[PDB]
Every structure is written in C-alpha cells, then in structure tokens.
Symmetry: C4
Subunit: 387 residues, 4 copies
Amino acid sequence: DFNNLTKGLCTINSWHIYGKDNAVRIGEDSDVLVTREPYVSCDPDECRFYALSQGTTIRGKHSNGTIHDRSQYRALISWPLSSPPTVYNSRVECIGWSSTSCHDGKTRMSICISGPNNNASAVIWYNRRPVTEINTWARNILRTQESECVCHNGVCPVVFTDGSATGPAETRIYYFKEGKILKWEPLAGTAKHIEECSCYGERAEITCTCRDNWQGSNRPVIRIDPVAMTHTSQYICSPVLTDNPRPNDPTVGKCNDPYPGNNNNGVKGFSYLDGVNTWLGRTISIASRSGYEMLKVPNALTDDKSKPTQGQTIVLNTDWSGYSGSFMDYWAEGECYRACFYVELIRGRPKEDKVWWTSNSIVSMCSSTEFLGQWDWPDGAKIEYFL
Amino acid sequence: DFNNLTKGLCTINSWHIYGKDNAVRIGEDSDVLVTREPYVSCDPDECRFYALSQGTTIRGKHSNGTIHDRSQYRALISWPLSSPPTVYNSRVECIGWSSTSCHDGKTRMSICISGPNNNASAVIWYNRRPVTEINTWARNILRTQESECVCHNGVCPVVFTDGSATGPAETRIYYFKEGKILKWEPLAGTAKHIEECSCYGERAEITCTCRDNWQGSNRPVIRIDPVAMTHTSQYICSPVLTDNPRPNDPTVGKCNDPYPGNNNNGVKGFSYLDGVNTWLGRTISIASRSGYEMLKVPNALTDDKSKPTQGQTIVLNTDWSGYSGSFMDYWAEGECYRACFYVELIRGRPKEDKVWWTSNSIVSMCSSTEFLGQWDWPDGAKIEYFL
Amino acid sequence: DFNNLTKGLCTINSWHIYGKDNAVRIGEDSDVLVTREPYVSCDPDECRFYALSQGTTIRGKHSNGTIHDRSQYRALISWPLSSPPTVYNSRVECIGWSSTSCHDGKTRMSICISGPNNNASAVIWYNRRPVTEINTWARNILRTQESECVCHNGVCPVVFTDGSATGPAETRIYYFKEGKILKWEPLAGTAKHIEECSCYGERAEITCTCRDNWQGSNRPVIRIDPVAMTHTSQYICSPVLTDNPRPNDPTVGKCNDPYPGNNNNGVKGFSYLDGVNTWLGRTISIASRSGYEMLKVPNALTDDKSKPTQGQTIVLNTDWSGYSGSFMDYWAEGECYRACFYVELIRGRPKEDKVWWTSNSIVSMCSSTEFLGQWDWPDGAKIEYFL
Amino acid sequence: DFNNLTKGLCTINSWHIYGKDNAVRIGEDSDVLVTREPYVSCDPDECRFYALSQGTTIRGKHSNGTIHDRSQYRALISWPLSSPPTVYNSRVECIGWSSTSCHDGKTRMSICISGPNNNASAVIWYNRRPVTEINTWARNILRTQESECVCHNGVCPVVFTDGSATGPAETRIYYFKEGKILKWEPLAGTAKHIEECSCYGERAEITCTCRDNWQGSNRPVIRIDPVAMTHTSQYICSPVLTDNPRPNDPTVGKCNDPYPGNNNNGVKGFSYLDGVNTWLGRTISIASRSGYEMLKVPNALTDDKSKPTQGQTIVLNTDWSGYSGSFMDYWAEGECYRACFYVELIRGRPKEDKVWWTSNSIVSMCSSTEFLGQWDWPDGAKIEYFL
Ligand SMILES: [Ca+2]
Ligand SMILES: [Ca+2]
Ligand SMILES: [Ca+2]
Ligand SMILES: [Ca+2]
C-alpha cells in the first residue's frame, strides 16, 4: 500500500558511513561501467545505487570522450548497494541522459529523458513498463533532478526545467500518481532559476534544495505539499554559501534573491532544513569541486545571519568531489526518518587531463544521534595506473 | 490463465525509445556474445532480449567466420532488457540456428531448428522441456520467423518455410497448444513466397508481415484467426515499398502480386496495419541495409495508391541497420495494446571488411499517442578499436 | 513428496539435440573453469550441467597439469543448462575428485569423495548440508559413478568401488534415504569388475550399465530393485561391443563373462535396455575415444547374437569424445520417461599435446518417437588459438 | 522465530572437508577480490563465506600495498560457499576494517568498524539497515572478533577491545537484541588481554576462545551466559600451547595466568571445549603461521597437565596458514551441533616478498563421529605465475 510521510527527521548529531563502492579502484581491472550523476534510492526491501551509464567500460576504448553529457549510449542503471556498477550486474531502468526515480510504496516510478537538445522527451516508466510521455515545452534541454523523487499516498511530484541555463527558463512541478499525470504547475515563489533538485519528505511535506545556475551562490528551495498539490520557492537565508563556484561567506545573506558573485555555474547539492536540526553540505573549495563537508547551521532557511555551530568533513580538500543529493529509507524501522546523503567523487576529465574519460564513485552517509568520530572517504583510485 | 487478445492497438502518433543494449560498444572490452537475428519478447512479468548466439565472444578468436548463419555452435539465448548479451547473464532457450518464442499466458514456448540443410528438425520446447519434434518436409533449410509468435487462449500458430529461397517453397502454419500440435495447413492466398514473419495480434486476430525472398519488393501479409485456425495471405497494396533491396517507390503498387525489380533477396521487416493508424518500417537505402524509418501510410494494406502522411527516422542513412520485427507487451496495463518494434544494427562483415566477425546490437521502440521529438539511435561502436 | 518411478520408457525412434555448452570455444576468451567428468541432472523445476572443476580457468596458468585426476583443488560444481561452467555462475556442491548426485523428489543428495589414494572418504550431503561420512574399505581409491544416481520413494542407491583397477576390487551398493544409510551390500551376480555406473530407472526398477576396467570389452549391468533393496549383475550379451579400447565386433558375444582382447582400460558409457527398444552408445573408434554413435540392437542384454537395426552418429570419428552417461527428467510431463544422455568432448592432453591442460565441453541429447534427421555435434574449439 | 541453543556438541572423532574456494588459484586469471580475515556464517537456509575486501582485485594494480589492515577501501563482503570472492558475485554487508556477523533466527546482524585509529566507530546493522552506533571508548583502534557471533532467543553478545595491543586495554561484552543495545559490561575474570574471539554456543551457553596479544602463549576463554547476560574469563590450562608465535609445550601450564615466552603477538585461533570431547587447533610452526593441526586434548580447559590423545593435520608445515575460527550450522538437522571451523591461508606479503599484495583463500572443515582418513588442504596457488 502507498507510503505515507508520517514521521519526522531524527536528530542528527553526526554522520556514519552508509555505503561506498570503490568503482574506479575496482574498475582498473574489472568490467565496471563509466557513469556519472549517481544517487541512491530505497525500495521497501532494499536500497540501491543509481547512475547514468555512458555505455562503455572505464578501460574500454570507447571511454575516450565521456566528458560528454548527452548521447545515445547513456542509460539509467542501478545495482546492489556498495558494489561497483558492472556490466554483468547492472539493471537498466530506462534510456536517457537525465533521470529521477522513486518507489511509491506499491512499486517504483523511473523517468528518463532523451533527445536532441531541441526536441527532447520524457518517458515515465512505472512498474518497469512505459506509461506516459512528455515533450520539450521550451525546447532547450528538458532536464530533471538527477536524484530520487519522493512520494506520499501515491502522489510523487517531479521538478523539470526546460530552457536556458544562463538565464530565465521554464520550470514545472508535475504531480504523478501511478505513473500518470495528475496536474502540473509553473514554478512559483521568489527563486530565480532552478536545476537538479535534491528532495526529501517528512510529516507530509516535501523539501527540495535545488541549484540556481545563472546567479545564485545561495541555494533555492522548493517546498512541496503532496496533498494540496501546491508549492513555493525561496532561498536559504544563511550566509554560509553552499554552491560552487562561489564567493566567500559574508556575515549576512539573501532570503529572497540570489547572492551575486559568480554567474552561470553551480553543482548539485542538498540540505536538511529542520529548525536547529539543520545541516548543509558543501564543497570545501569555493573555486573547484574539491572536498566536502557538512555544517550545522541552525535556522539556515529563515535566519539570514546564521553561522555554523558544528561540522563534519566528509572528503578532504585535496580530494575531488562533485554532485550530492539526499535520500532516506522511508521503510526503515524506527520512530523517525534517518537522514542520508551521497557524494559523487568525479575522476578524470576535466581536472585530470592525462586520461581521456570521466567517471566517478560513490560515498554515502546517514545520520546518527550519537557523536561519532570522523574519517575522510576519498575515491582512492590512483590515476597513474590508467596510463 | 491463457492470454486473450481482447484489446486493440493504441493510437500511434509517434515512437519513444524503449530499449537499447549498446552491445558492440560494450563488447570491445567485456565478455559479450557474438549474436544475430535478435528480437524482444514479453512474459507476464518481464520483457527480454533474444538472439542466436554464435557460441563465441566478439573479441574471442573464434569470432572469425561468424558471417555464417547455420552451425553447431549457435543457440537461442535471452537476457535482461537493455543489457548486452554476455556470457555470464545469458539464458539458453534451445539449440539451433533458427527460432521463435512466445509466452501463452501460462508459460513460454520456444522453438529451435538445427540440422544439416537437407536433414533439419524443429524441437518445440514448452515450459523449458522439449515436447514435440518436426522434420524437414521439403528438405531444404527448414526455417521460422526469427521473432516472437503470438498466442490467444492457449493457441499459438507459427509459420515455417521449407524449400528454395529463390523459387517456390513449402510454407506451413502450425497451430500449437501446450507445445503440442493441434493442426497445420499449407500456405493459402495470393502471396508467392514467405520468409521470416513478423507478427502481432489484436482483437483476436493475428497479423504477420513477412518477406518474399524471390520476387516481391512489396511485403506479403498473412492474417491468422486463432479461434477458427484458418488464414489467408496477400500483399501490402501501397507503393511505399518496404523491402531491401528494392526499386524506387512507384505511384501505384500491387495488392495480389509481387512488385518486380529485384530478385532473390530481402530483409526481415514488419508493419502495423490498422486503418488510418498504419505504420510501416523500412531501411532508408534501397540498395543497402542502411538507415531506418517509420512511415504513416493510411490504409496501406488495401489502398494501392497510399503515400506517407507522417514519419519518423529511427536510424540515419549513414548508419547500418538490418532485421526488424514487431512485439507488444500483452500484459501491460491500459485499454489498448501499445505497438513496439526493434531494429537489428549489424556490424562487421560483409560491409565492414576490416574485421572478421559479424555482430549486432538492438534498439527497440514503442508507440506514443503524443507527438514526441525524434532522435536517431545508431549502434555507436567504433570499428577501429577492434583493429 | 518423494518421486516414484511409475512410468516406462518412451519409444526412441531417434535423438534430438537437448543441450550444448561450447565451453572450450567460449573459454578461449571468458572466465570458464577447467573441468572433466561432466553429467546432467534434473531437479523438479530445472535441469543442470555438472562437473568436477580443477580449480582454475582454461587460460589461467594453473591449468598446466590438469591432465591429473585427483587433487585438493577439484570440486563438484553445477551450472545452468547449456551455459559454460564459469567462475561467476557456478555453484559448488561439495569438495572432491569423484561424485554423484540426484534429487529424490523432496530435495537433492550429492556425494563427493576426497582423500589420498589410501585414506579417502565420502561425504554425503543432503539439502546442501553434510550428513553422512564413509571411509575407504579397501583403501585403494574409493570412487563412484561420475554421473547421477536415481531414487524411488526416497531410496537412492549408489555404487562405489574400492580397490584395484586392473584386478579384483570391492564394490558396494549403498541404499540412502534422506542422506542416511539404510543398508549396503557387496556386488553380486556374474560381473567381474565394476566402475563408473550409468543408471536410469523405470517402472520401479533401476538399471546401471557400468565399466569393467580390467577385462571386459562388453559392459556389465547392475539391475537394482529399490523396494526390496537387492540387486544382480550380468554382461550385455550382444556382440556389438561398446567399451574402448576394444577389439572388433564378433558374430557372437558373452552374457556372463568378460569378452577378452583388451586389458586394464575402458571409458564411461551407458545404454537403455528395453526389449526391442534398446539403444547402445559407443565411440566409433576401437582404439581411441573418437566419435560417438547410438545403435538400435534389439534384445542386446539377453540375445547373444544381436546386431544393429538402426543407428545415429552423434560425433564424427574425426572428433574427440570421451565419457558418457544417462539421465532422464523424471518430473517432465507425459505418460513415459523420455531417455536422455550426454557425451563429454575432451580437449587437450593427452591426444592434443601442444597445450598443457585437459578440459571438455558437453553435448546432450534426448529421444524422439519421430524419425529426425541427424547432425554431428563436435566441440568446435580451435586448438591453435590457445597457442 | 529466534534460534535457541538447545542441543549439545556431537562427538568429534575426526574432521571432514566442508568448504574450499581456491581463490588465489582462480584469481590469477579472474576478477577475484583481495581480502583477508575471512570466516563462515550460516543463515537458516544457507551458509556463506565472509571477509574484509581491500577494494581491489588481486591482479589489479591497486593491490600493491594491501599488506595494510585499516583503510577507506575495505568492506565486509560475503559470497556463496566455496566460490571465490569475486567482483560480480560478492554482497557488501557494511563498510569497515573490522567486523562480526550472526543470524539470530529471524534475521542477520552485521557489525563494521571504520575510522582513524583514534576516532573509530561501530555501526550495527540489522536486517540490512543501520540501527546503532558506538564510538571509541579508549580511542585506540576499536576492534571486534573477525568471525561470527552467536545468538540465543534474540540476544547476541559481541566482544570488542579498545586500547593498546601490547598492554592493558579495555574490553567490553555488549549484548544486542534486534540490533539494539541491551547492556554491556567490562571484561571480568582472570584473562589479561583479549583480542579476536572465536565463539560457539551449545546448551544455552556461549564459549569464546580469544587471543591475548601481549603476554599469553596459552589462550584466554570467555564463557558467556546469554540468559543472565553475565560472563567470566580464564585461560586454557593445558600445556599444549596454541598461539603463534609461542615457545615449546611444557609438561605443565597456566589456568589463570598467561604462559610467558613471547610478547606482543599472536594469531586468531579457536577451540571446542567439551569434556573429553575437546579439540584444539594450532599452527604446527611455533615461529611462523605455518601448517595447521587439530589435537584431541581431553579436559584441556581445566586439566593443567593434559596432552594429546588424537590428532589431525589440516595443512602441512610447509604450507602457509593464518587466522582460524569457529562456526556451526545451528539450523542443521540432527540431535546435536556439528562443530566446524575454517583456516585462512595467507599468500603474499610478508613471507612472500616477490609480490606486492597480501591475500588468502579459505579451507573449512566440520566434525564427523566417524574416523575419516586425512588429507592436507593447501592454498595451491603458484606464486610464480604472478610475476
Ligand atoms: Ca549558482
Ligand atoms: Ca524481396
Ligand atoms: Ca574394459
Ligand atoms: Ca600471545
């Protein structure tokens, strides 16, 4: 029967290692697939890794050129937790270069976009069969979250953007039930530009922290109500800026406007916005996708002067990071939802020029109410063995 | 309980990418099997890829010579949708160099032919055990559809041809129930020569678009009634000729005779013949198996002057195609049958001489009532990496 | 519930290809295990391939020396029908260099022997746990059938030999129920020496055709009654001699004595002994394990002048064969038991010196009441690609 | 429903080969993972192999350096019995460089420790989700058993040590029920230092034979009562010393004190302590982890002069051994618990310098009431093929 967001977030006093696949390490001498834009997603019975294959192995010759995002040979694949995405164990969800996926309690919905930049289309799959199709409205790179959606009593909303990446675009929230469209609505609120939303849900409310690609160093937030099927957007108020690249943290920041300083760029990220129980993730570098850390900034969403009270380094500044996004095991035992996240560890091009490919591996963490010691969790591949 | 063709075809206003395995790309550095003559086929619970293995990997040395059709080391294998047919994940159905396969609702029937050209035999398997055997009647290359059959309340007919390929031959429609022969009957109607039939069924009627190898540039059609166990054949009337090689489209074409101009050659193909809701597939080239496209030609079967009103390019003329065939997920949700098809993308010999093998990959599409933008879906392997 | 041999043998008017794995072909560029002494065995729900691994891949370096039979790194593995025995898909049954295995209807019993030649022991496994252990009685290479046993209402007898191979030895029939020993009894009847028995059962009777290694060119037969738990032995009377090596067929042969002419050698083989419905298998060569054929010799067991009335060549004399043995799918649909068999196709040492290993692949056939044309089914590997 | 230790140990009159994976042999030309610290563990339905991956294949280049114990790329993986731990078949349990795992009857609990040496933490997983977290108390390499725990009516105790390895440390027995902490208690009794406990349970009592790393050549024993949740410790009295390195066996030994002679070193080991039905395992070498043997020393725990009455060599002194530990199939049929154990066969560094890695394979044995002949069970890899 349909899942229903009835619990709230547990208290996050630190983070524990949840998953880690060591793909590029293992892929130096194994049949692992070149992938990117990963995420994690739970069924009622198991949690899995997810990514867009590039349709080639890392050591395969057809890996030259996989710095490229959109092509005919990309796909949404998933595999067992903490395994590497191999040729022999990966399951294909749908064909496309942009995706999102979520179980509703009864079964799983998966969405893939393919197409030329000016004539793309989404095919919504539900219970492993195609059900609904949508075409470019703005006709400039139709695209979704690149991480899991969230459902509540059968309704699962998904944010798409179609249009420019360095300007005004058209974003829609679609509300699906059983893979079928219930309704959709243009973006509302004060957010200026929306990309790659990272979502979670608790107490019958869904929160997505997204990416303003053309203006904002602070991150927009869509809050969604899955029962009334309406929404609104804003920016995180805090001065602890969490996009990349970004300027340095000011002492005061914006609540309803992009904080300026870098244009036309960002990375996928997330946060858990929960009163004083609020944690933001970010690359440590402001210039580069390097390092990763979590920061406890009470009332970040609302308090425009808020600054960190506690923190945890996940990846050292010397180590390459990348995209990141939220997920929770909604069918786990317990009185509250335990917050989890993942970081994509990009390897290869552009920063690592001596190779001709671009891949990644995954580290995943979840919260603890304990205060656990911290380690750092690098990819751990040695680029020189690929030469 | 037995499946019953009770729905009709949905409205096809365009086609969406359904499946794609990228085998030859992935097989440059993975243990993928050399195969050909693929197809797709659905059980009640999952849809799979199917093909005739050549009993060797692509990079394996025993791949030299796999331009050859009939040998002791060929087999019908199936694998998970959109995976590549690998050594470690493929399931063997039966041993043979010609096949067809279909689930009847209760369980699956698979048919393989093996033998020397003059002493071949079919073994009908049902629920993974061998049940019934048939011997060459004409004693010249007993052969079947090379794509899935169709059932209705337990009866699943299959078209075989035995005899010459460049002349009069003996074709039979066998009607199986539970893997056992109910009846068979010689070919009837006006079709002159029958090979490799592509079949679908709706509203308790089965339509196969086949291949006249010795005369026809227009395609013969067998219509089958699974309740009365009778049939009849014809040719598609339209002048939009859909075999290969073929002459150019005239302004008027044949309904009960082969349209002349090329002898003793063709390729497997298909169509969905549904009033104005009619779509034909073809190679774009008339000379070569190059490119692929779908064309909307209302009343093609009956209207001998019919010409296209809408179209979709699937594979660009610069890209190699090959066989193609129909399938539908008869156990999918919905009020109508959503039409699907697949194209075999041949690589290697004969057209690509620098390698000593011949393999292929698969693209598969299904219909949408939407009007989706179009992309082209090439194999995407780079023949030079095999050198 | 326990299986009960209640049907009789179908009429065998010819043989159809049942299974074929092409392992050595595929193993030239895949991770396939060096094996030997294969067989086939059916559960209620699926039929599988079985063999003794040598604990190395064919292309692996540790394959030098696998001409050797008994070592610490051998095991009974099984795998899906017609796949090759690969590292990633094979299931280990037990550890040993001699084996037999059979499902009793409720679950499967598997028996492996390991040890030094003078201190060997059998461990009987039942439902994948070890249950019963037996030690060398004669203390000279304890050994079993190397093909599947047969059960009836829970009782499954197994023939072991312990002792000399070129002389008098001690053979016992053990009767197991639920993996536990019910009873055992020394060999009886007129057979002089027993090795590697190939067994089948019909109408509550079990027939094993075995191998007299020190004297007989004609094959001994143990007939077993699974209800009374007694047995008796004999030789096949016919002059169509079916061991190897062997002299030429005389016009008259022995019923209760070894036919003389070659000493201290043989190969595993089988027959189906059923009135006029009797078929014997043999290598075509008398000198070498070359070629394979089936022969219809009515009343072979009893009629000491019987000579062939029909035949089928399975492997041409120019192609290497090896061991062979019987099996039937006792849970198949139908009024009679359809007779099946397999041939081991040995490759490498001794006959093929340029390589340093010894492996094999499998062809398997079952009967038809039809008269099917015949093909020949060689291994099909090309020894020169291993150089 | 929860498992309940209600049977007692069967009579062990000898040992039979239970499992053997030949990983390093097979890993010379297959995608097998570098691992160490293995063990075996049974679910209600199957028994599996377990080990800490090093996140690389043996032939992979990232295997240089895997002599190292604690890193970010290690994990607890399990795989099917007697298979090798491959990239494509291994299941990841949790992320860490120290572990233990046991099914309680209802489902399985797995515990992994990760961290820097001074800020480590345990995450207790239960039914494949994380549930409970514990932090370093002594802040010097938090560590567990490196072999399976044991449960009784839902309570499963686990021994951890935190502190120095060559001195006084802090050891705790935690008692888990449903993955949650019931209670814990500091170490008690006369044992001086505790590491890597090997545990079994019979008649509602749990016995762990552990390792005193700084003083004892004789092995400490924790006996645990899972109903009262208390414990006590001691040393095995016997003079047949079973650590390594160790001095030579005296004629008399300690019951409540470490027997002196080697400092600050040992290996994981085990024993089954059962009146006269008592068997100890040990390396044959006193200097080196070489060879392995079992010894029957009646009343070893209590009788401080006890010396062997029977024995079995498992691995010859010329062959490398390593860790060892106990397990039993608590859900096996029968009136008593059949005692099993495993030996880790280390290959590579330190003793085998010409390679740059360190891996192992597994041999596993269980008891028989029979008196079975003995074989020796070496790794069987040939280090020269890795050069
Ligand atoms: Ca930005
Ligand atoms: Ca033609
Ligand atoms: Ca003989
Ligand atoms: Ca010690």
